[PDB]
């Protein structure tokens, strides 16, 4: 038997006298606990708001609120997806409730010294949708764990080792490049940025090959970013690599008819007697040059050569994900990512995917007039203009390295990848796993078309 049962209630739905006396008015995520009818167990009444305004995000948030209110129970049954009357179809309700339950239960206690809850059950006939939601949420929590991991544990070599182990679990193809084998690939930005650190850099390629469409995902894996010699105005700057790895791990379970390759440059950015210097010039894999005008804009320099490699003459589409710029957050706020692409059809695909996933993105323009801020007196471009517009300038910088004719999108997720404000809804303090579920929904949509 369930120790606790969570009942979804839209505004106007009947609850008992005790629930009314406690102030239950079905506000989204409001929870009031009471004894079960027979007095042997617990019932949670959980608000879903007005039936007419409810979305999948309402259900996701209500499930997370339910799991947070479980107390010392061993078993919890969520009946939330059985609540009908909203416009959210049964399968969408089931998927969202399953996701919210896993996301809301997430804890990162690995590094504390010194959970009665053994089973969460989602009630619904939509078993496929439950499975899909659990898998998406489990992938999100993998990314959360990677971001939360101290940089001393998750070094570039350790991260490469972890990716290899994850790949083995579905027999994703995995190649790890290190030392002389890495030098051979000509990823000059990665090796230049990574050299100051005592930890050597790594490059990992991770392939799902279950198709007619091949998608390349590029994820920024800076495991610790101190700003280098220039300083910042630090373990979470591998959030892009975390999102890409996690999305790839979810694909074998979903069984999408789509080939997907992950490209993952891993490094630390540290000050040191041998660190990358202001004024240095990097000669990239495509023969073009970048002048290092600020060592804290290292991400774009690392990604450059990987985008050349990923788009070389073959992937039909390349998507990069990176915690790239701080300028983004000033106008967009802390919970919204930035999307760049020249392809309007790809923009709509990514944006609709983010809406299904409950993740907030804003498309920003690849402004031609900001290219003047890439100009260098010495090299082909700079990595920092010291002027306003760095979020757009970084996107334009990356665009230079994507081979002619290859559709491309760039996701700048610096702010929403790490929550330094309190927990809310299904999102914890700290590493969030932001963009995992957007990526999965994007890949699902691309596989259909």
Query: Contact between 189 and Cl ion (CB under 5 A)?
Result: no
Query: Contact between 389 and a copy of itself (CB under 8 A)?
Result: yes
Binding pattern for the stretch 396-415 against a copy of itself, x by CB under 8 A and - elsewhere: -------------------x
Of the candidate residues 50, 271, 407, 423, the single one contacting a copy of itself (CB under 8 A): 271
Q: Is 298 annotated as a binding residue?
A: yes
Could you tell me how many residues of this chain bind a copy of itself (CB under 8 A)? 55
150 binds, among Cl ion, a copy of itself, none (CB under 5 to 8 A by kind): a copy of itself
Residues after which the chain is discontinuous, using a C–N cutoff of 2.5 Å: 114, 210, 233, 313
What distance in Å separates the CA atoms of residue 47 and residue 26, rounded to the nearest whole number? 4
Query: Contact between 279 and a copy of itself (CB under 8 A)?
Result: yes
What distance in Å separates the CA atoms of residue 265 and residue 128, rounded to the nearest whole number? 35
Q: Are the beta carbons of 292 and 279 closer than 8 angstroms? A: yes
Binding pattern for the stretch 131-160 against a copy of itself, x by CB under 8 A and - elsewhere: -----------------x-xxxx-------
Of the candidate residues 99, 286, 370, 400, the single one contacting a copy of itself (CB under 8 A): 370
Applying CB under 8 A, the span of 2-10, 101-109, 158-166, 324-332 interacting with a copy of itself comes to 324-332
Of the candidate residues 10, 162, 235, 437, the single one contacting a copy of itself (CB under 8 A): 235
Query: Contact between 300 and Cl ion (CB under 5 A)?
Result: yes
What distance in Å separates the CA atoms of residue 205 and residue 172, rounded to the nearest whole number? 10
SS3 call for 109: coil
Cβ count within 10 A of residue 237: 27
Query: Contact between 58 and a copy of itself (CB under 8 A)?
Result: no
Q: Are the beta carbons of 265 and 306 closer than 8 angstroms? A: yes
Output the smallest distance, CB 373 to a copy of itself, in A: 7
Query: Contact between 299 and Cl ion (CB under 5 A)?
Result: yes
Which residues are tagged catalytic?
Answer: 232, 300
Specify the long-range contacts of residues 354-357, CB closer than 8 Å, at least 24 apart: 354/438, 354/441, 356/56, 356/441, 357/136, 357/437, 357/438, 357/440, 357/441
Query: Contact between 45 and Cl ion (CB under 5 A)?
Result: no
DSSP state of 11: T
Output the smallest distance, CB 336 to Cl ion, in A: 19
Nearest Cα neighbor of 143 from 226, 238, 262, 57 is: 238
Nearest Cα neighbor of 323 from 400, 224, 425 is: 224
Q: Is 220 annotated as a binding residue?
A: yes
Query: Contact between 352 and a copy of itself (CB under 8 A)?
Result: no
What distance in Å separates the CA atoms of residue 276 and residue 302, rounded to the nearest whole number? 12
What distance in Å separates the CA atoms of residue 353 and residue 383, rounded to the nearest whole number? 31
Output the smallest distance, CB 287 to Cl ion, in A: 21
300 binds, among a copy of itself, Cl ion, none (CB under 5 to 8 A by kind): Cl ion
The binding site for Mn(2+) consists of 220, 225, 237, 296, 298
Residues that bind Cl ion (CB under 5 A): 297, 299-300
């Amino acid at each position: 038997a369930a120790d606790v049962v969570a009942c979804g209630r839209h505004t106007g739905a009947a609850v008992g006298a005790f629930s009314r006396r406690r102030g239950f008015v079905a506000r989204p995520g409001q929870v009031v606990a009471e004894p079960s009818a027979d007095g042997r167990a617990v019932v949670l009444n959980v608000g879903l708001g007005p039936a007419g305004s409810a979305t999948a995000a309402t259900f996701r948030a209500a499930a997370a609120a339910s799991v947070r209110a479980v107390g010392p129970a061993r078993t919890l049954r969520l009946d939330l997806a059985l609540a009908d009357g909203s416009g959210v179809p049964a399968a969408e309700r089931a998927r969202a409730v399953a996701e919210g339950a896993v996301l809301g239960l997430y804890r990162y206690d690995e590094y504390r010294s010194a959970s009665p809850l053994a089973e969460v059950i989602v009630a619904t006939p939509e078993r496929r949708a439950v499975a899909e939601g659990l898998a998406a949420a489990e992938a999100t929590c993998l990314a959360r764990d990677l971001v939360n991991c101290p940089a001393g544990t998750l070094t570039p070599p350790a991260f490469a080792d972890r990716i290899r182990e994850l790949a083995h679990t579905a027999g994703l193809d995995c190649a790890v490049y290190e030392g002389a084998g890495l030098t051979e690939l000509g990823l000059t930005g990665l090796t230049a940025v990574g050299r100051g650190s005592a930890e050597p850099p790594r490059y990992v390629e991770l392939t799902y090959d279950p198709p007619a469409l091949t998608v390349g995902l590029v994820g920024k894996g800076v495991t610790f970013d101190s700003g280098g010699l220039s300083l910042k105005p630090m373990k979470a700057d591998m959030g892009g690599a975390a999102a890409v790895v996690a999305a790839l791990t979810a694909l074998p379970r979903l069984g999408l008819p789509l080939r997907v390759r992950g490209h993952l440059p891993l490094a630390e950015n540290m000050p040191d007697g041998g660190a990358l210097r202001v004024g240095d010039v990097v000669r990239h894999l495509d023969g073009t040059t970048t002048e290092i005008t600020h060592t804290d804009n290292e991400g774009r320099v690392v990604l450059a050569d990987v985008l050349v490699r990923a788009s070389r003459p073959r992937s039909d589409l390349v998507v990069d994900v990176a915690t790239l710029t701080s300028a983004a957050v000033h106008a967009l706020g802390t919970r919204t990512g930035a999307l760049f692409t020249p392809d309007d059809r790809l923009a709509q695909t990514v944006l609709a995917a983010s809406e299904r996933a409950g993740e907030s993105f804003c498309r920003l323009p690849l402004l031609a007039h900001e290219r003047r801020n890439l100009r260098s007196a010495v090299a082909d471009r700079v990595n920092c203009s010291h002027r306003h517009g760095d979020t757009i300038q970084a996107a334009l910088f990356l665009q230079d390295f994507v081979a002619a004719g290859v559709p491309w999108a760039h996701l700048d997720i610096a702010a929403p990848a790490y929550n330094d404000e309190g927990p809310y809804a299904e999102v914890p303090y700290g590493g969030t796993g932001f963009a995992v579920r957007t990526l999965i929904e994007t890949l699902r949509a691309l596989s259909e078309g």
